[PDB]
């Protein structure tokens, strides 16, 4: 069996939309599969459960938290949304659904005390950029004069930081002096300071080069495990990467923890897009993923505050 990675011919078009770059940097291997060779692995949906949901976990809990966060960001009545979700059967029956709604309302109110603390009314604006003869056309929603304000009921992850960094690069390149902030759960916060237009265009050209490299060859940039390895090896005090053996062992430990998860959290290695390339994580491909994450995910932790 020959290797699936092969050098393919690819010509970068003139007009590349921002949605294509967002879908690329959300998952690079999936964007190499489902867009270049148009192979999207379609998994069958889960079966209907035999009983009513007694607890909230997974996609249903995330949708309930997202609707509760969108309702509390406008200071709307949470009890009306409680009656709306109880009328559909997505909540548990009786007092347990009320307990779940009370603790989720407490968590979303604790988050909204930080979200609407620095929220200004902003409208969606247009983005038309020309970088290295490549046209980027798109739209940015809810652009406030303070900068970029995004809120999602998720954990501290590197993919949302990459999305916020891409939005900050596409926002600061055409005016827009100000910070970019994203507020996650459990006091998670991604902040990026405003930068000049030249550094923003340089980083945007680097991301465009990474996009045109990801279409020819499968760009092995793991967001979660590569970001964990990088933040284990990065030092924000001296702005230099450490080279001692203890940090090289702790980064390998964090990489093995983030790639293959525990028996309760699905790790990054348990994915249909990564098992097609390799069946066992070889140290050569591990060092290749480490080098690609050091090349690409470095301004994520360099401008983090």
């Amino acid at each position: 069996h020959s290797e699936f990675v092969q050098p393919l011919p690819f010509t970068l078009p003139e007009t590349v939309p921002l949605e294509t770059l967002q879908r690329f940097w959300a998952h690079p291997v999936r964007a190499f599969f489902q867009m270049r060779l148009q192979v999207n692995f379609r998994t069958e949906d889960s079966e209907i459960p035999d009983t009513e949901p007694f607890i909230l976990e997974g996609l249903s809990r995330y949708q309930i938290n997202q609707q509760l966060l969108n309702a509390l960001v406008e200071q709307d009545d949470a009890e009306r949304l409680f009656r709306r979700f109880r009328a559909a059967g997505d909540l548990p029956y009786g007092a347990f659904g009320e307990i779940f709604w009370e603790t989720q309302c407490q968590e979303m109110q604790q988050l909204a005390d930080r979200v609407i603390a620095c929220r200004q009314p902003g409208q969606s604006m247009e983005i038309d950029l020309a970088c290295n003869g490549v046209q980027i056309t798109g739209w940015l929603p809810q652009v406030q004069p303070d900068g970029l304000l995004r809120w999602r009921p998720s954990l501290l992850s590197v993919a949302q930081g990459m999305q916020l960094w891409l939005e900050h690069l596409v926002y600061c390149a055409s005016g827009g002096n100000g910070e970019s902030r994203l507020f996650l759960r459990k006091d998670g916060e991604w902040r990026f300071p405003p930068l000049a237009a030249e550094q923003a265009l340089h980083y945007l050209s680097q991301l465009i080069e990474g996009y045109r490299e990801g279409m020819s060859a499968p760009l092995l940039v793991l967001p979660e495990s590569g970001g964990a390895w990088l933040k284990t090896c990065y030092d924000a005090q001296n702005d230099a990467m450490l080279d001692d053996d203890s940090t090289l062992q702790k980064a390998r430990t964090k990489f093995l923890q983030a790639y293959e998860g525990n028996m309760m959290v699905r790790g990054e290695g348990d994915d249909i897009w990564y098992q097609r390339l390799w069946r066992q994580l070889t140290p050569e491909t591990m060092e290749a993923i480490v080098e690609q994450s050091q090349r690409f995910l470095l301004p994520l932790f360099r401008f983090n505050q």
Partner: protein, 1129 residues
């Protein structure tokens, strides 16, 4: 205890055989079986010899019963040969032959035993219980036929959901908050009580009363908190305790927190500051008021609603499961034990036990350590002190490691306290004497090393034939036990596991590097054997450390297999690839599923191949065409033909075998293919197998067939096996890297030291926790003994100062809390230097130690060799000629009969009506009504049906005018079935011209196409009847859909005969009748006896038209002889 002799064991009453690990237990069972068959022993013998259908052998594992039955059969054959020859090569067989005086009767009894070994009573526990429930079903009250279910988790989860619906739903908020604080849902409660719902229900110490509900307990705890709140509100505003150096002056602020505590009684968890108001803690840091005493009384017991809900769940869920299985009529594995225990618990069922004494007046029960208390209660109900019956409990208390499954060592201790005689096996035939001396040195450091008074350890003796077993290295003779002490003061768990896995992988690659050069050897006397990869085995306890060992061994290019892998094949990527392939085969029109299935790892295509397949439209056309051909093979031939054609055309099997690591993938693909072919035969639909595959992907449940198998047996691999799966096996070299890792049990479920019953303490009492931790430590010591006594030549141990406590350097380590440190440190808490001195104290020639060195030089050396030349045979000719036994079908006003429904089923119903009705007797209308009631047609058609039947029967069908009523019962013959032979290849072109030469109806009718039929031809003639010395044939046709008027003349009937091709059927009927009249009647002439063939169209018979409906045709009497000459040869 006493030593056990197989020829001196008294087979009277109850005997307890303690067979140690490695001893010949399977040989001793066969020796006692031969002793019970022949009736040997003299004074200690049985009073009468027993047959094969009276000897009961009880062993839990089914493969163990099969192996024991085969070994007993081989011993029966060997003893029969040795008794017929009066000589043998075995000393025990020599003493067996010397004990008998007669030789012919013993040989005849052994021959009868060899003949009746098929009807032997060697069953399992649940099999014997099911046989006793099905046999004597009257005293027990069991159904004759029932359906066993393999998985009981679904009904248990359904009953737990029913309990959570009927208990937790109508609770108010103040109780449901505490219920949510105890468990999130019913799944956590089921995970808590799953070890108690199965098997015997334990006794709960201090249970709640039956009238106390959740609301009463909640109100009691609310009043208990409110009394303390009232006593705090009355005694507030004063402080009389002396100020100490430990006591800070901010305690009143904590009292201010209590001023924020007494607001409402809706909460359940009190403040931590009440721990500052304890008289036992304030005196150690002066308490005068009894408010501190009331606070200490409140904090003495945990305020929890958990115990009442657990008691109600154990009372409700098991009853709901039993009610559901009694309604559905199903049975379970433990249900047979419960039914037999309830049968023997009754009054008349004791007499049923006497029937069991009528059935088998003996019992030999193997593996008595894995015995439920219900099983021992049954065996005490049957075979306690009754005469003429013998009980032989063969087991080992040092191997009871199945306490999680339902076994209990306290039942074995009760059995040892009940019986009087004890027998042990002194000789050990498995391991080297160095390992035997190491085991007898390690486990006999202190008295009662297994910490129970009823489990004694004895020094075992090694074998005389295996006293020269030596595992030699390149340098010198390697000792038996080598405790690899990990260097360091204190370490974690994962770092210790990683370092010991690296040390074990280095030892494996060193033994395999020196083993292929003839340096490291296994020597028996002068014989030598090189150490292969299958000799070294790593003994782990869990799956995480097994995966760690597998990764640390495949890092050094050493392949390793996992014998204890119970993962399903439907949970891997290959099941998803097979699902994508079946979805692409079933729906090949949509290119998205086909493109997603072609790029899988099973096909083995690169990205450039997928790009060129998406660019070239003709290649995708060829792919869609061959996938449509695969779908046609899948619809016409089945699952396995389509998969074999896919693996042969794409040649993916050769590519997977050439790929390093693809053989396991190919075996998993073949197993998934076999399971899909097994499930696809029971389903007629094609999408149903795809839905079943998607369901089994979504269902991770493990069956006996749906588990992963061994990938290869020819190539030697390092076998990883758990401690429970290594019971009864044998390994040359054993490595135990994680034998120092222990776990602390949190739940309080123990056994009483006097009554020997299971006591579950739902409260957090420290005495129950200590009494459960003692049984946990005994189970860990038994696991240590089981893991140590499997090595033959060499065992290696990993010792390290492991600290379960989170403190880094506290001056003490927790190795005394493990099983190995209780024997090394003699049950005393010590340090790392103390553990090192305890290791270095017991140093002999067999027991040594070395430090753990981390280092790697080279992975391995493959040393490959070229494969031998081979080819495949090709079939030269056809396997068989076209031989087939076929029939004619294989070679091809408001109520009126015109308004009758036209179909195959009404045609067969009218044929059955004309077959069952007697022609001489007049038609009765009530008989027609009964036949229409039996058939299921309308009742209004009956008075028209009977007059239509009489109008058909009154109409004659002959050239002279002979009706059907003139035919007697002897003259008629209905539904004559004939077989016609043909030895020539039936060519249609040579037959149709011969038909058209004589038959006038073949003017049109272009000839049908059929293959050469050589063999037999089946036929069913409707009616044959004789009249005035002339035979006649009659057939019935009743479809007639296209005619409603009187247009059924002779021309329309001839057109129907030419269209439906009934001419060949009538010609074969004339040939069959000619051959039958030639064979039956001697001197037969075709023109003299045969009269003609009549076809009867039922819907064409009219009262005014006698010719319409009937069709009379007679052959030319020249085609029949030529057809007979053609069919003959």
């Amino acid at each position: 205890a006493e030593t056990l002799d197989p020829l001196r064991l008294p087979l009277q009453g109850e005997r307890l055989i303690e067979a140690s690990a490695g001893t010949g237990k399977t040989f001793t069972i066969a020796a006692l079986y031969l002793r019970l068959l022949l009736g040997l022993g003299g004074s200690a013998a049985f009073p009468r010899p027993l047959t094969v259908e009276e000897l009961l052998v009880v062993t839990f594992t089914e493969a163990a019963t099969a192996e024991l039955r085969g070994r007993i059969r081989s011993n029966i054959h060997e003893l029969r040969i040795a008794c017929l020859r009066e000589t043998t090569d075995n000393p025990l067989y020599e003493r067996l032959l010397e004990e008998i005086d007669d030789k012919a009767q013993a040989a005849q009894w052994l021959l009868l035993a060899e003949r009746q070994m098929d009807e032997a009573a060697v069953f399992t526990i649940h099999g014997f219980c099911q046989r006793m429930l099905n046999l004597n079903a009257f005293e027990s009250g069991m159904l004759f036929e029932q359906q066993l279910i393999e998985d009981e988790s679904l009904l248990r989860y359904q009953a737990c959901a029913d309990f959570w619906r009927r208990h937790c739903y109508p609770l108010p908020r103040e109780i449901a908050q505490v219920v949510f604080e105890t468990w999130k849902g019913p799944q956590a409660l089921l995970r808590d009580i799953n070890r108690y719902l199965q098997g015997e229900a334990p006794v709960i110490k201090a249970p709640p009363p039956d009238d106390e509900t959740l609301a009463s307990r909640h109100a009691q705890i609310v009043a208990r908190i409110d009394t303390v709140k009232q006593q705090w509100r009355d005694a507030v505003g004063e402080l009389d305790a002396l100020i100490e150096s430990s006591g800070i002056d901010r305690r009143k602020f904590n009292r201010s927190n209590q001023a924020k505590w007494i607001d409402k009684i809706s909460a359940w968890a009190e403040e931590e500051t009440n721990s500052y108001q304890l008289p036992e803690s304030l005196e150690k840091f002066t308490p005068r008021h009894p408010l501190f005493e009331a606070i200490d009384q409140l904090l003495a017991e945990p305020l929890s609603i958990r115990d009442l809900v657990i008691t109600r769940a154990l009372a409700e869920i098991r009853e709901t499961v039993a009610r559901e299985k009694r309604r559905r009529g199903e049975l379970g594995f433990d249900d047979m034990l419960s039914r037999l225990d309830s049968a023997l618990r009754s009054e008349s069922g004791e007499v049923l036990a006497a029937a069991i004494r009528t059935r088998f007046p003996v019992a030999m029960i193997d593996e008595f350590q894995d015995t439920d208390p219900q099983q021992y209660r049954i065996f005490r109900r049957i075979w306690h002190h009754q005469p003429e019956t013998a009980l032989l409990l063969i087991g080992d208390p040092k191997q009871a490691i199945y306490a999680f499954r339902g076994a209990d060592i306290f039942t074995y201790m009760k059995a040892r306290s009940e019986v009087h005689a004890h027998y042990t096996l002194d000789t050990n035939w498995r391991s080297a004497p160095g390992m035997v001396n190491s085991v007898n040195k390690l486990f006999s450091q202190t008295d009662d090393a297994f910490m129970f008074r009823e489990i004694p350890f004895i020094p075992v003796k090694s074998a005389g034939k295996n006293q020269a077993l030596r595992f030699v290295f390149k340098g010198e003779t390697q000792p038996a036990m080598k405790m690899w002490l990990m260097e360091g003061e204190s370490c974690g768990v994962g770092d210790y596991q990683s370092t010991m896995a690296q040390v074990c992988a280095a030892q494996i690659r060193d033994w395999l590097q020196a083993g292929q050069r003839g340096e490291a050897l296994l020597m028996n006397g002068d014989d030598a054997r090189p150490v292969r990869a299958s000799d070294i085995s790593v003994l782990v306890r869990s799956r995480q450390e097994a995966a760690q060992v597998r990764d640390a061994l495949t890092l050094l290019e050493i392949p390793s297999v996992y014998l204890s892998n119970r993962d399903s094949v439907f949970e891997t990527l290959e099941a998803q690839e097979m699902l994508w392939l079946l979805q692409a085969v079933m729906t090949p029109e949509r290119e998205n599923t086909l493109r997603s299935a072609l790029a899988t790892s099973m096909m083995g295509l690169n990205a450039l191949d997928i790009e060129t397949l998406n660019n070239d439209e003709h290649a995708w056309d060829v792919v869609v065409e061959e996938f449509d051909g695969y779908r046609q093979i899948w619809r016409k031939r089945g699952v396995m033909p389509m998969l074999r054609a896919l693996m042969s055309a794409r040649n993916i099997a050769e590519n997977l075998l050439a790929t390093a690591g693809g053989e396991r993938r190919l075996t998993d693909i073949l197993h998934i293919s076999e399971l899909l072919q097994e499930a696809g035969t029971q389903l007629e639909s094609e999408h149903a197998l795809v839905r079943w595959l998607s369901q089994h992907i979504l269902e991770p449940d493990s069956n006996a067939s749906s588990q992963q198998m061994r990938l290869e047996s020819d190539k030697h691999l390092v076998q990883i096996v758990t401690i429970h799966k290594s019971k009864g096996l044998e390994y040359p070299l054993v490595w135990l890297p994680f034998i120092t890792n222990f776990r602390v049990q949190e739940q309080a479920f123990y056994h009483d030291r006097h009554s020997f019953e299971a006591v579950l303490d739902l409260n957090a009492a420290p005495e129950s926790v200590d009494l459960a931790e003692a049984e946990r430590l005994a189970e860990d010591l038994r696991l240590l003994y089981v893991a140590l006594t499997r090595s033959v030549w060499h065992c290696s141990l990993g010792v390290a100062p492991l600290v379960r406590r989170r403190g880094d350097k506290k001056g003490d380590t927790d190795v005394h809390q493990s099983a190995l440190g209780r024997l090394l440190q003699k049950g005393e808490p010590q340090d790392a230097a103390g553990l090192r001195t305890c290791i270095e104290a017991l140093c002999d020639d067999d027991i040594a130690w070395q430090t753990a060195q981390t280092g790697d030089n080279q992975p391995w050396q493959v040393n490959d060799v070229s494969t031998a030349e081979l080819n495949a045979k090709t079939l030269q000719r056809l396997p068989g000629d076209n031989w087939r036994v076929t029939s004619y079908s294989g070679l091809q006003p408001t109520l009126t009969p015109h308004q009758f429904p036209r179909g195959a089923s009404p045609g067969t119903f009218l044929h059955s009506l004309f077959e069952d009705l007697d022609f001489t007797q007049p038609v009765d209308p009530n008989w027609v009504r009964e036949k229409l009631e039996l058939g299921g047609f309308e009742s209004q058609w009956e008075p028209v049906l009977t007059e239509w039947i009489t109008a058909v029967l009154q109409a004659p069908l002959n050239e002279t005018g002979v009706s059907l009523s003139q035919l007697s019962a002897r003259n008629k013959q209905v539904e004559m079935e004939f077989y016609l032979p043909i030895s020539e290849p039936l060519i249609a072109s040579q037959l149709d011209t011969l038909i058209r030469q004589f038959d006038p109806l073949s003017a049109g009718c272009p000839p049908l196409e059929f293959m050469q039929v050589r063999g037999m031809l089946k036929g069913f003639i409707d009616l044959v009847f004789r009249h005035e010395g002339r035979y006649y044939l009659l057939a019935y046709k009743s479809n007639w859909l296209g005619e409603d008027s009187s247009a059924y003349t002779q021309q329309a009937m001839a057109a129907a005969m030419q269209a439906h091709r009934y001419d060949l059927q009538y010609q074969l009927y004339t040939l069959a009748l000619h051959r039958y009249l030639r064979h039956r009647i001697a001197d037969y002439d075709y023109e003299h006896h045969f009269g003609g063939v009549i076809y009867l169209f039922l819907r064409g018979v009219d009262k005014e038209h006698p010719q319409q409906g009937i069709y009379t045709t007679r052959p030319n009497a020249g085609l029949i002889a030529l057809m007979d000459e053609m069919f003959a040869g």
